[PDB]
């Protein structure tokens, strides 16, 4: 695994292997609210997820992923800036080494403690995730800023599952879960054209960033950081952080739905 988040293989070094790191549509960004453009043409975000599409949780070494069956349109995102239906395939989190930072997106310079990514691919235009992932209109990702405070009970199934995937490569079934339960009450959002926030950093993402945060406790964040990046039997290496710094807007417009 050439890339990671440590001093030698981390975000400031990704450009050596992935020159798109220094591109014009890189994510995440700082959303400066004085510079957002309210767009009257934005429709409300519509999510409709079937809990039976939940499939598997996986320790991928730098993070963990919760994957969904994506063979049909049982679980879809519509509305907002999109004409096309986008098919749910994954959610995951980013976090930092301490409570002070850990989100990827920031709002008016303010860093949150963690961030939820709910990822979808354009099944109107493309035939698979692998095809869509490199296309400018291929991916739609909802970002939710997670503010340290009260324990969030909606995270329970996810946190309880981590003990079965402690080390790199471990995976387990993760079923009967609707991740719309993790979204805030308001789906008021910012949107901008951007990228995956880690390699391969493709500029394929329409970002949908929620205005409203969701909560997370200090102890729930500790559960994320207690996951191990090493394989079973090796020296324990906690997953301390996996958030990328904010990237230059390079003249992009962040639009507001509100
Ligand atoms: N950084 C990143 C990478 C991927 C991956 Cl691992 C692929 Cl192999 Cl496409 C994906 S995804 N949704 O897994 O295709 C999303 C992101 S993110 N953090 O939401 O921008
Ligand atoms: Zn992410």
Author numbering: 3 to 260
What wording appears in the published article?
Human CAs were better inhibited by AAZ, whereas clorsulon displayed an inferior affinity for hCA I (K i = 4516 nM) with respect to hCA II, IX and XII. Cl atoms were introduced into the model with zero occupancy due to the fact that there was scarce electron density around this portion of the molecule. Clorsulon contains two sulfonamide groups and it is interesting to note that the sulfonamide which interacts directly with the zinc ion is that in position 3. The amino group in position 4 formed two hydrogen bonds to the side chains of Thr199 and His200, whereas the second sulfonamide moiety interacted with the side chain of Gln92 and established a water bridge to His94. On the other hand, regarding the hydrophobic interactions, the aromatic ring of clorsulon showed a connection to Leu198. Indeed, His200 in hCA I reduces the space available for the clorsulon tail and forces the second sulfonamide moiety (which is bulkier than the amino group) to move towards Gln92 (Gln115 in SmCA).
Carbonic anhydrases (EC 4.2.1.1) are widespread metallo­enzymes that can be clustered into eight families according to their amino-acid characteristics and differences in their active centers. They are present in all living organisms, catalyzing the hydration of carbon dioxide to bicarbonate and a proton. Clorsulon is an anthelmintic drug that is clinically used against Fasciola hepatica. For this purpose, the inhibitory activity and isoform selectivity of clorsulon was studied using human CA I and S. mansoni CA, revealing different modes of binding of clorsulon that explain its inhibitory potency against the two enzymes.
